[PDB]
Each structure stands twice: as C-alpha cells, then as structure tokens.
Design a binder for these strands. Structure first.
Length: 33
DNA sequence: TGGTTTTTATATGTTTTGTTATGTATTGTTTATTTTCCCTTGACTGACTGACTGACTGACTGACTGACTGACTGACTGACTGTATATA
C-alpha cells in the first residue's frame, strides 16, 4: 500500500561493521595480545 | 536454551532558502551663468470730512395788567323803650 517517495536499488551497501574493537573485550584486563 | 523482530548508524539523495561579490546604468554633487515675473518704491487721483461761517427757535427776568378781594365807614331798618293818653 505505501509508496517510497524515491528509490535507491543500484546501491551497493558494503558489509562493514559499526562496533569498534573498544566493545568486544569490555575491560582493560579483558584484552588479549 | 534458540530463533526473530525492532531500532540505529552510515551513507546517500532531494528540495527549499539565503549569502556574497560584481559590472553597468542612472542619478546626484559642486560650481558658474542667464532669464522671469512677483514684490518694493512712489507719484498721481479721487472721495472724504474737521474748523469756520450762518441761524433758529425755545427759556428765565422786565414784571404788567386788571379784575377781584379786603378793611373802613356811613346808611338804614328793626328792636327797644319812653312819652303819652284814657278811664275808674
């Protein structure tokens, strides 16, 4: 029923992440080398 | 435990509105010069109206005039009173 007011389909979205490394150890002691 | 949905970050697209610099044309600024009729300056012109010359008829003193009024005085008529006259 809805209509998008303007289309982007030839987009090529890149599979790249927004979570930095700062948020996959969660502590100073929690980090490997 | 385990699969699914909802929101968000990044990335891009869309549209409206407002900012700044500029080159060309119009018009203003200053200064010098000539013409136009409005506004001062003034004698001429025409009616005006103050002092001087005429004048005109009502007011108070000159009392006047003349009839009338007021005191005096004699004339006269009525009331008072004596001389007189008559009778017992």
């Amino acid at each position: 029923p809805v209509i998008r007011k303007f289309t982007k389909k030839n987009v090529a979205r890149a599979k790249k992440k927004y979570t930095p490394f700062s948020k996959r150890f969660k502590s100073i002691a929690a980090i490997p080398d």
